[PDB]
Design a protein around this nucleic acid. Structure first.
Ligand SMILES: [Cl-]
Ligand SMILES: [Cl-]
Ligand SMILES: [Cl-]
Ligand SMILES: [Cl-]
Ligand SMILES: [Mg+2]
Ligand SMILES: [Mg+2]
Ligand code: NA
Ligand code: NA
Ligand code: NA
Ligand code: NA
Length: 326
DNA sequence: CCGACGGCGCATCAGC
DNA sequence: GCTGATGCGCC
DNA sequence: GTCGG
């Protein structure tokens, strides 16, 4: 982190744009700039130097000059002092409260953790769980703990059906020493792009993980995606482990490589790769890569037998997961 | 200058 | 009840 | 806010 000061500033700007201004393209622009600066291997000496990086433009270069000179950004100093902006930014830290809900809550006068706790009746199911575990959800998960969680999930899934394959993705698969949450990609030969030969494939797995008290709460659940809370078991006399977020995604078995590409991320990596695909005349989702016809309609799914095949289509050199942390 | 900016699952609500 | 919009979430 | 054409 040679340029941590700058990347922190840009991230705070991004969050303000997303949460307060509700400007999603500005949010993405700031994050893209922060990401490109974060991997730049020199300590940045000026705005002009930064402006040579793709995604850093005139306005960001100016902000960088201000920050290098003074160590702060007047724009941010003002935003921090603003009560409405401060409140909104805080409320969006609760899982389930977005920019819209946060602004609506602040209008009602609900703008602190204390206010939230006394107005549970005003929260939906997801938000009530987000509040319950507010503290826990902001803690990172050490890789050592991720390994214990992997063992529980993989062993429990095997007990449901030995044909399931579960893969931990996200930052874990990128080799991070700590993770924000646990991301699990699940496949079963009965669920392909052509047919669903068994019902409740995801349900059976969630149920089993609940039965062993690993999964503790549910935020949302459908046929292909579960979003919930889990917790490692603690030993006798041991303090409990924090509750953790868990996401499970059931992907058609024949579409594993596209699925694991998506779920490995990072998010900014996915955005960059998908944008590059479009420039190259292709569209990528978690299921397929398809050509874009002259008109605009996506064509038929192209053959994929490896993650690398996807990179080959868009003429990118292959990047191992560890090199996708953007 | 101006259009595009990644793609999608689940929850909630309005209209019919 | 369904369909489409919108919010919020995931990478 | 930035980029491409
Ligand atoms: Cl915007
Ligand atoms: Cl600052
Ligand atoms: Cl695939
Ligand atoms: Cl598809
Ligand atoms: Mg994750
Ligand atoms: Mg994430
Ligand atoms: Na630039
Ligand atoms: Na939130
Ligand atoms: Na996740
Ligand atoms: Na573009």
């Amino acid at each position: 982190t040679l340029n941590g000061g700058i990347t922190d500033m840009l991230t705070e700007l991004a969050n303000f744009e997303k949460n307060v201004s509700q400007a999603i393209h500005k949010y993405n622009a700031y994050r893209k700039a922060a990401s490109v600066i974060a991997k730049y291997p020199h300590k940045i000496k000026s705005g002009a130097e930064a402006k040579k990086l793709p995604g850093v433009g005139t306005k960001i270069a100016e902000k960088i000059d201000e920050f290098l000179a003074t160590g702060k950004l007047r724009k941010l100093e003002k935003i921090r002092q603003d009560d409405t902006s401060s409140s909104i930014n805080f409320l969006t830290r609760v899982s389930g409260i977005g920019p819209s809900a946060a602004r609506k809550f602040v209008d009602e006068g609900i703008k602190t953790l204390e206010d939230l706790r006394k107005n549970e009746d005003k929260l939906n199911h997801h938000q009530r769980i987000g509040l319950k575990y507010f503290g826990d959800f902001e803690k990172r998960i050490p890789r050592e703990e991720m390994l214990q969680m992997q063992d529980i999930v993989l062993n429990e899934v095997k007990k449901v059906d030995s044909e399931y394959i579960a893969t931990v993705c996200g930052s874990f698969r990128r080799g991070a020493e700590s993770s924000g949450d646990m991301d699990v990609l699940l496949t079963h030969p009965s669920f392909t792009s052509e047919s669903t030969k068994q019902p409740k494939l995801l349900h059976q797995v969630v149920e089993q993980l609940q039965k062993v008290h690993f999964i503790t709460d549910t935020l949302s659940k459908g046929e292909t995606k579960f979003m919930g809370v889990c917790q490692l078991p603690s030993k006798n006399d041991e303090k409990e482990y924090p509750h953790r977020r868990i996401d499970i995604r059931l992907i058609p078995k024949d579409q594993y490589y596209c699925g694991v590409l998506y779920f490995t991320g990072s998010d900014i990596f996915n955005k960059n790769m998908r944008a590059h695909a479009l420039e190259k005349g292709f569209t990528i989702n978690e299921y397929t890569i398809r050509p874009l016809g002259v008109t605009g309609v996506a064509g038929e799914p192209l053959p994929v037998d490896s993650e690398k095949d996807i990179f080959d289509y868009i003429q990118w050199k292959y990047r191992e997961p560890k090199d996708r942390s953007e």
